[PDB]
Amino acid sequence: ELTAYARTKTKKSRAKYLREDGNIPTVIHGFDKATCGFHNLNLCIPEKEANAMVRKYGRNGCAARVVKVKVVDHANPEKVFGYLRTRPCSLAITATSLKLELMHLQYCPQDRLVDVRVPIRLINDDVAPGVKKGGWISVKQRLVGYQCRGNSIPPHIEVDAKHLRLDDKVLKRDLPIPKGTRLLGCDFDAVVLHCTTDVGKE
Amino acid sequence: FRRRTWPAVCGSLHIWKKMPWRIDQAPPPMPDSKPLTRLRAKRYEGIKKVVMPNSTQLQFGLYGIRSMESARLKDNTLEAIRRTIRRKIKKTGRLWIMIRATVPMTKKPLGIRMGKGKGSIDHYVTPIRPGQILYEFDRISRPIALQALRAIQPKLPCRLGLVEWS
Amino acid sequence: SSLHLTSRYHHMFYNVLYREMMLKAPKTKVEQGPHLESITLTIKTTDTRLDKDIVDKWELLLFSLALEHITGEPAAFLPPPNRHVANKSAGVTVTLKGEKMFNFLEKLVYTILPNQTGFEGVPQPKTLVPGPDGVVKRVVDFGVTNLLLYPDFEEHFGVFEPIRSMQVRMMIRSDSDESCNMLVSGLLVPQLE
Amino acid sequence: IEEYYVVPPACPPPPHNPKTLKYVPKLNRTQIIARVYEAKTPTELENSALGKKFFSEFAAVAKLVRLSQLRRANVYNSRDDAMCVSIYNTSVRVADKLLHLSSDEELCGLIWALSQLPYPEYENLVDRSLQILLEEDKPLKTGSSLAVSRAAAGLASLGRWDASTWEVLVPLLRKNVQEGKEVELSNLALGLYDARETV
Amino acid sequence: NTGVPGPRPEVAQKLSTEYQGHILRMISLAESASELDEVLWSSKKHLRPVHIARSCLKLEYLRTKEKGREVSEPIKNLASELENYVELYSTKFTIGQVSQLVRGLSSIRRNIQPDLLLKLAAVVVADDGRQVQLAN
Amino acid sequence: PLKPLVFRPLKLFFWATNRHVHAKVVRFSSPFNEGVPVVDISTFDAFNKLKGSAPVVAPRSLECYKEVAKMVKEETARQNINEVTLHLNSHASDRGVREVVRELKNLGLLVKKV
RNA sequence: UAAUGCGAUAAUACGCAUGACGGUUCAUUUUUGCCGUGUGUGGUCACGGUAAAACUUAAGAAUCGUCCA
């Protein structure tokens, strides 16, 4: 659960005053203007909660998670406007200090189709013929694109490498496809994992 | 405010508009292996202070080192850092180098008065922008990355930080 | 009118051969099938008694005349290798399409090729770089080393004595190299493999 | 100096990868026929069945039958007239290729639809349908009087007046009138044939 | 603007410029009859039939807020001034522009001179009603 | 070396498609306003006319091209139009369009390119 | 803009045919960064610009593939 506050219509130059106070601007996309009044919603989220979410999940890992947002009045914390079900999309972060600047979220009901870049995870990498011989498992694509339903978003893809030897390559065709999701794109036969001994010839 | 006249707002001949390199925000490309040029440059080409975009991340590895300040590094400094990193990490480590010295610099010998043209090439440099990522590592642990960071910090004039992929 | 104005092969390709290829290699669209586009005949200086890379056009008139007899259409001189050289060429060429293309193929296969000593099969097709239109084309190249097998060079032998050899190229549009081989087989041209 | 090219290999879709996560239910012949008839405008009729999987022989017959009803019941502008012409041209050509797969009812409807529509008749669609139904066994075994009534009315409008075919239809039409089935079409056909006999 | 050949050269050969859009925006941005008068005074020398036609509709829009009171004095002054342009451009209007001129001046309960109405009616009387098809 | 544009009140336009050739005559008052089409004749109209009397092969035929020119000549003559300017574009070089233009000049209509 | 578009005899009388799925190419200024000018102890300031450069989620259009779930 995340807490958000309503905002007034202001210029871009007024955003730094919110960060100084301790809140990060956020935008929620994907509403119908006819029935809701806006196509997008502007709010601000406390930095303390925002940092915890990123640390717990990660900058890219949190994009495959579903969160609950509660909108309340800044002056009176007990006034609740409503609740929303959303998933993070992207994060704007300073390069020199690694501080949050802007959060993009998508309105994600349980019956909507969304495109998610799911991270790839490895299991039983220590117990592998290639590792024992002296090789290592190199990941060429950290994230892979999927089309998932709102009710079923895979937190991550589990690829087992317990039976991989040297020069073994795992392509997109071999990745698991959980229920309620399908692979995106047409560039199949792309290397995702590679058990090798090369270290870049450095 | 934009410094132009009314005829210029309507009939400007600058049809193809390119943002000057000094203030362009596009990230620099990956270094190539082309030979160094023998054409003298201007001093501005070796300096760039605009910060990096607010979406920069690691591209290949799990750990890396970034610069918190702008600077101009010579070819000699890069070679010393490369040897230090290679020795410190391991022989069995994956290293990506994201920088290269390509901008020539000139100098004149002692005992020469001002004038009579520009000097000859002496060495090469590369500009560094704030928040830029310099090196990436893989097939190592986090403690090893910290050791590499501490080893090179005394050898550089700018503050350094650690970046992790998540 | 006691003149040759029809084409046997043309009728065979469209009314007989085309359906058979469709059955062997089903395709979604009717027009998606092997097709023979053009045949090019070339005579260069290296295929003649003259020993020189660049020769004057008046020395190549005889070979141009020979192609006219073989094909029935006038041939053209090759473009000069450079702007500096203007009056010298490097060979002659002629291109045929449609009915004339089919008639030439029929006569070559039925009469001339069987009488050539060292013939086993035509080489395999080669794929060229697609042009701006994005169409992939395959070329089959072979040469005829005995041009004095045609029954037309007998009226004035002394004139046509220097005629030695010729090169032939065929352009085919198809989905794959296997389809090209199927079309060539339908044309009764053995392929060397 | 002549470069050569390598065709990139094809990309076969991986197995167990659904083509779509949307709900697209399967459609049978009965559902397609119901969808085609439940059309109100030429545009809806045009889009009621498209593609070689749904635009089959039975769909082509349904489009022609429904087109006749809409043409008679409504007046159209230039744009809708062009849509109707496109519907007629495509449906007949499909029928000319899958005629041998048609059923008895479909052939009876096709004759009735062709007679009502004012556009030029295709090559020999009516004659071919007559030949298939000329065995004299299908009309006798046609349980549904609707097919017989449509065939009888269609031929009368087209003025075929085949002696053998009509002689068979007469007792069938009279029986249908007695049974109260397809009275309007049967009466219309009988009246037209009786007028022809008088003339 | 496009140079691609097409079925309707009549509506494709029209020349559209940025300067025309600039003036049309100013007319629409005006929030009162007093403001609209100043806009037209500045642009006296750069008014075309399209601008005149749009201005008449602007008077209709502006008077909608004055639901209770009668037509204000500045609105009447604008209507008289615009009529001078209508006479000047009487033979340079399209059927669409004439259509919105009459509606604009009729909404202010103004009466056009009979001679001017006769000239404007030529859009539908001439060419045997061909121009009626152009109208949507 | 593009020439400056010259405004003309009456212009002739052609639209060549896969199936038909369309000719229009449009009157203009200024470049900033839409024109008024005074003639609209295509090979579709000629085909429906000739086919009833004299069989033709298809709309894009020499017989229909001459018929379209004749119908255009009658309309311009009735409306007292004797001189027009041709709008040059890619479609103006079509063989069917060129045949129509040649017929119009012979009939008596003065067509100018510049 | 179905009097459309495309085609491998390519000409246009004949062939494919306007739906449906999939992959490509094109709104509270989306709101953050950044840039310009003025002022300035070198930023607790103001306004504007980005149809010059990084950055969001859609919806539609143009091809292309396809017996169609």
Side-chain angles (χ1 to χ4, degrees):
Chain A
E1 180 174 347
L2 295 177
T3 301
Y5 302 119
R7 298 173 59 189
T8 60
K9 184 178 180 179
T10 62
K11 296 179 176 181
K12 193 198 304 187
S13 58
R14 306 291 136 84
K16 58 177 174 295
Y17 301 134
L18 286 167
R19 307 196 195 97
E20 182 174 355
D21 193 70
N23 295 270
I24 304 298
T26 175
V27 184
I28 303 177
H29 307 267
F31 288 106
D32 184 6
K33 194 157 180 171
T35 60
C36 299
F38 294 105
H39 182 57
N40 304 325
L41 186 58
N42 299 337
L43 303 170
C44 66
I45 302 172
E47 185 180 1
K48 182 176 176 61
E49 298 177 353
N51 287 339
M53 184 189 66
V54 174
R55 184 173 62 259
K56 184 175 180 180
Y57 299 122
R59 181 171 185 175
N60 299 277
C62 71
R65 296 282 188 170
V66 177
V67 299
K68 180 177 175 178
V69 181
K70 181 175 69 177
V71 182
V72 303
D73 175 65
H74 185 260
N76 192 333
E78 297 296 347
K79 185 178 180 180
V80 181
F81 290 96
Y83 297 91
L84 291 174
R85 186 175 179 274
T86 64
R87 60 168 291 269
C89 289
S90 61
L91 300 170
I93 298 173
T94 57
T96 61
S97 60
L98 305 180
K99 297 176 69 62
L100 291 166
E101 288 183 331
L102 180 67
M103 301 178 64
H104 291 273
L105 291 77
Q106 177 180 231
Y107 175 61
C108 183
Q110 299 183 24
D111 57 359
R112 183 175 180 178
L113 301 178
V114 295
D115 297 358
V116 183
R117 299 178 64 187
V118 186
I120 303 302
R121 303 295 178 84
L122 299 178
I123 299 175
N124 297 324
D125 59 330
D126 58 331
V127 182
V131 175
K132 294 179 177 179
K133 293 293 183 181
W136 64 296
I137 300 172
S138 177
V139 185
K140 301 295 184 177
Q141 302 184 48
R142 312 283 185 178
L143 300 156
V144 180
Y146 280 72
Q147 184 175 22
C148 310
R149 292 178 180 177
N151 62 320
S152 180
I153 299 176
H156 58 262
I157 303 300
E158 294 181 359
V159 180
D160 191 326
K162 184 177 180 180
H163 301 283
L164 296 184
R165 63 182 62 83
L166 295 180
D167 300 331
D168 287 3
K169 297 184 177 183
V170 182
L171 307 180
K172 288 184 177 178
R173 302 180 176 278
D174 304 329
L175 295 174
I177 301 177
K179 181 179 179 181
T181 176
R182 54 182 295 273
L183 290 174
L184 290 175
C186 190
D187 61 331
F188 296 101
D189 300 328
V191 180
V192 178
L193 303 176
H194 183 194
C195 184
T196 182
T197 61
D198 183 71
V199 293
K201 301 180 177 61
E202 295 292 349
Chain B
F1 173 83
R2 190 166 155 185
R3 186 158 296 178
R4 51 175 182 173
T5 54
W6 177 239
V9 176
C10 311
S12 181
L13 288 180
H14 306 296
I15 307 305
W16 308 109
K17 298 180 65 175
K18 56 167 184 174
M19 195 128 187
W21 174 83
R22 290 187 291 94
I23 52 177
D24 188 358
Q25 194 172 20
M30 186 71 183
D32 59 353
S33 62
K34 294 182 180 179
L36 300 175
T37 185
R38 300 296 303 180
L39 182 64
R40 282 86 66 80
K42 296 177 178 65
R43 285 182 172 78
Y44 80 94
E45 306 184 21
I47 303 163
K48 182 159 180 174
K49 302 179 174 182
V50 298
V51 304
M52 296 291 295
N54 51 334
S55 62
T56 61
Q57 310 178 36
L58 290 169
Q59 302 182 77
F60 310 100
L62 297 177
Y63 302 96
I65 296 172
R66 62 176 171 88
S67 179
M68 302 185 183
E69 300 176 341
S70 58
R72 189 176 64 182
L73 300 179
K74 292 181 290 181
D75 53 0
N76 299 336
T77 303
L78 296 177
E79 295 296 345
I81 298 293
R82 185 186 57 78
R83 293 193 294 268
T84 305
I85 297 169
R86 189 79 266 180
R87 181 173 66 264
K88 178 60 65 174
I89 290 171
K90 272 332 179 186
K91 285 184 178 178
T92 58
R94 185 68 185 87
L95 179 66
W96 289 274
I97 300 175
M98 306 299 180
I99 55 182
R100 186 192 178 191
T102 61
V103 184
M105 302 289 291
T106 63
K107 183 179 292 184
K108 291 193 174 189
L110 297 173
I112 307 302
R113 304 181 183 180
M114 302 292 93
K116 292 181 183 298
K118 191 178 177 62
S120 62
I121 294 173
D122 184 67
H123 58 280
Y124 293 78
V125 301
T126 183
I128 303 297
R129 289 162 54 176
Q132 184 175 2
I133 297 169
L134 305 175
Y135 296 97
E136 302 185 3
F137 315 114
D138 194 0
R139 195 179 175 179
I140 61 170
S141 64
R142 186 177 182 275
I144 301 300
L146 293 172
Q147 293 179 359
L149 178 60
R150 294 192 295 270
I152 62 174
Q153 180 64 80
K155 296 183 178 63
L156 291 169
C158 59
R159 188 177 176 181
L160 303 171
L162 182 72
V163 293
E164 307 182 8
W165 193 96
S166 180
Chain C
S1 60
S2 301
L3 298 175
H4 190 278
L5 301 175
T6 62
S7 179
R8 177 194 167 190
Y9 249 69
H10 185 277
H11 178 92
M12 183 180 64
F13 171 76
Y14 290 103
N15 295 271
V16 179
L17 182 60
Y18 194 86
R19 182 178 184 180
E20 297 178 358
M21 293 184 293
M22 297 172 61
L23 293 169
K24 296 172 68 64
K27 295 294 179 183
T28 303
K29 295 182 178 178
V30 177
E31 64 278 6
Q32 286 178 332
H35 277 87
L36 181 60
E37 295 185 357
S38 62
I39 301 176
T40 304
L41 314 183
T42 302
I43 299 175
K44 295 183 178 181
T45 59
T46 61
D47 298 331
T48 65
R49 294 177 177 178
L50 300 172
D51 183 5
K52 190 174 181 181
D53 298 331
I54 303 300
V55 299
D56 300 0
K57 292 182 176 179
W58 61 269
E59 292 176 344
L60 296 176
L61 292 170
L62 181 62
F63 305 102
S64 179
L65 181 60
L67 289 174
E68 186 174 0
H69 282 269
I70 297 170
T71 62
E73 296 181 352
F77 290 92
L78 295 174
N82 57 71
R83 184 182 61 84
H84 180 75
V85 178
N87 61 323
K88 306 179 176 296
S89 181
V92 293
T93 180
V94 57
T95 304
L96 298 92
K97 297 182 180 180
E99 290 74 0
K100 294 293 187 181
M101 180 184 64
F102 289 114
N103 293 347
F104 170 83
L105 183 61
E106 181 186 349
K107 186 178 180 183
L108 177 64
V109 172
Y110 268 78
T111 62
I112 302 301
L113 287 177
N115 291 268
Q116 187 174 355
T117 59
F119 180 68
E120 303 179 4
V122 297
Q124 298 297 134
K126 296 184 292 184
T127 304
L128 300 179
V129 180
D133 59 1
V135 174
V136 180
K137 300 187 179 183
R138 281 87 180 190
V139 297
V140 180
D141 303 328
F142 67 88
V144 180
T145 60
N146 193 9
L147 291 177
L148 297 176
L149 294 172
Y150 288 89
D152 302 328
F153 297 117
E154 296 179 351
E155 292 293 338
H156 312 263
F157 188 104
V159 177
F160 298 112
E161 188 185 29
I163 306 299
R164 292 180 62 186
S165 58
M166 176 177 62
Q167 300 185 19
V168 182
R169 166 172 287 187
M170 307 183 64
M171 300 183 64
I172 299 172
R173 181 178 178 181
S174 60
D175 61 322
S176 57
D177 291 3
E178 294 77 0
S179 298
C180 303
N181 300 335
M182 184 181 64
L183 179 62
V184 174
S185 182
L187 296 171
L188 309 177
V189 178
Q191 202 157 28
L192 184 58
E193 178 59 17
Chain D
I1 305 173
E2 187 179 12
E3 302 295 349
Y4 296 94
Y5 177 80
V6 179
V7 177
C11 177
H16 301 288
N17 186 34
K19 298 296 182 182
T20 182
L21 295 174
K22 304 178 180 180
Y23 182 78
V24 188
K26 307 175 190 300
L27 296 175
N28 58 15
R29 292 181 60 188
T30 301
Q31 287 171 320
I32 298 293
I33 293 171
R35 186 178 66 183
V36 170
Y37 281 137
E38 296 179 355
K40 299 180 177 181
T41 64
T43 305
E44 293 180 1
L45 184 61
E46 175 64 7
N47 301 333
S48 60
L50 291 175
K52 289 185 170 61
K53 181 66 176 187
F54 294 150
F55 200 167
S56 179
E57 184 63 12
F58 72 93
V61 175
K63 290 179 177 176
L64 297 173
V65 172
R66 183 58 175 177
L67 179 61
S68 177
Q69 298 179 356
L70 293 176
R71 291 289 299 176
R72 182 178 62 262
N74 295 272
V75 178
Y76 295 102
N77 57 12
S78 300
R79 285 186 177 180
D80 283 331
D81 291 332
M83 183 65 70
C84 290
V85 172
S86 179
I87 295 167
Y88 175 85
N89 288 338
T90 306
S91 297
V92 299
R93 295 173 189 279
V94 172
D96 184 74
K97 300 176 181 178
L98 303 179
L99 182 59
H100 64 277
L101 297 174
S102 60
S103 62
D104 303 359
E105 289 71 3
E106 292 176 0
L107 290 176
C108 290
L110 180 61
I111 297 172
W112 178 241
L114 290 172
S115 179
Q116 299 297 131
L117 298 174
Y119 308 94
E121 180 184 348
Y122 207 51
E123 300 178 355
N124 289 275
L125 286 177
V126 175
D127 298 327
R128 295 174 178 181
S129 182
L130 290 171
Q131 186 62 34
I132 295 172
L133 297 175
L134 184 53
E135 297 178 356
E136 304 296 348
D137 302 331
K138 291 180 176 63
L140 296 173
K141 297 182 178 181
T142 304
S144 180
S145 60
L146 178 60
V148 178
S149 301
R150 289 178 176 177
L155 302 182
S157 299
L158 293 170
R160 298 289 177 177
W161 302 305
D162 179 71
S164 299
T165 303
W166 179 62
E167 183 178 0
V168 177
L169 294 173
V170 166
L172 298 175
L173 293 174
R174 297 296 185 182
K175 183 63 177 180
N176 296 332
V177 172
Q178 294 176 358
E179 297 295 341
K181 303 297 183 180
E182 309 297 347
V183 177
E184 292 76 1
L185 292 173
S186 183
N187 293 14
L188 177 60
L190 291 171
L192 293 172
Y193 289 122
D194 294 1
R196 178 62 181 86
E197 296 296 339
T198 302
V199 178
Chain E
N1 307 325
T2 187
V4 178
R8 293 184 297 173
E10 302 86 25
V11 305
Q13 297 295 317
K14 184 173 68 177
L15 181 58
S16 184
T17 67
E18 295 74 359
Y19 199 49
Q20 287 186 91
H22 165 244
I23 296 171
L24 293 173
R25 182 181 178 81
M26 288 190 297
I27 293 169
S28 300
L29 287 174
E31 299 183 3
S32 64
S34 305
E35 295 179 354
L36 181 57
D37 179 67
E38 287 293 330
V39 172
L40 302 172
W41 180 258
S42 302
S43 308
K44 282 184 297 180
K45 300 183 172 183
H46 311 280
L47 293 177
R48 302 202 185 93
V50 63
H51 299 118
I52 303 302
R54 293 296 203 285
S55 299
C56 293
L57 288 176
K58 184 61 178 178
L59 295 173
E60 175 182 345
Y61 305 153
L62 289 173
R63 67 184 303 274
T64 59
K65 63 182 69 176
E66 303 177 357
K67 190 66 176 176
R69 61 183 298 179
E70 71 287 358
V71 178
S72 63
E73 288 73 356
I75 290 176
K76 294 182 178 178
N77 187 74
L78 285 170
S80 302
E81 295 293 332
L82 290 175
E83 189 176 10
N84 290 329
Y85 286 97
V86 181
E87 182 177 359
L88 182 63
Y89 295 144
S90 58
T91 60
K92 297 173 70 67
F93 280 98
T94 63
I95 190 172
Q97 292 170 356
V98 171
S99 180
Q100 52 184 320
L101 276 176
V102 181
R103 168 173 168 176
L105 295 175
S106 298
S107 60
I108 57 171
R109 303 296 302 277
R110 181 176 182 83
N111 298 316
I112 301 171
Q113 180 177 337
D115 293 329
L116 188 59
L117 284 173
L118 183 61
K119 293 179 178 298
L120 297 177
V123 173
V124 334
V125 177
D127 297 356
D128 304 333
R130 280 187 188 87
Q131 304 194 31
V132 182
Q133 302 169 10
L134 299 167
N136 59 18
Chain F
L2 293 167
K3 295 180 177 179
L5 307 176
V6 179
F7 175 83
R8 299 289 178 84
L10 287 172
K11 305 204 77 178
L12 173 60
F13 296 89
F14 282 98
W15 183 37
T17 66
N18 289 329
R19 304 286 307 102
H20 300 273
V21 176
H22 309 75
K24 292 188 189 301
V25 181
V26 181
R27 188 184 66 256
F28 294 104
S29 63
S30 66
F32 299 107
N33 284 271
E34 295 78 354
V36 176
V38 296
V39 179
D40 179 4
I41 299 166
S42 65
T43 53
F44 177 87
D45 305 328
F47 179 82
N48 289 329
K49 179 180 176 182
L50 294 179
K51 74 181 188 182
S53 59
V56 299
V57 176
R60 304 203 62 164
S61 62
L62 183 62
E63 291 73 7
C64 301
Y65 296 155
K66 294 181 178 298
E67 183 65 7
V68 167
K70 184 177 180 180
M71 292 186 291
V72 171
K73 182 62 173 58
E74 296 178 359
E75 290 294 348
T76 58
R78 185 178 61 82
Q79 301 185 23
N80 303 317
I81 301 173
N82 297 273
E83 180 178 345
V84 295
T85 297
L86 183 62
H87 182 62
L88 292 175
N89 52 345
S90 59
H91 292 183
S93 297
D94 188 359
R95 288 193 301 273
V97 173
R98 280 178 284 187
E99 289 296 351
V100 173
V101 173
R102 184 180 300 97
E103 185 63 11
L104 287 174
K105 294 182 177 178
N106 294 334
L107 289 174
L109 184 65
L110 180 60
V111 183
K112 296 182 179 178
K113 297 183 292 181
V114 182

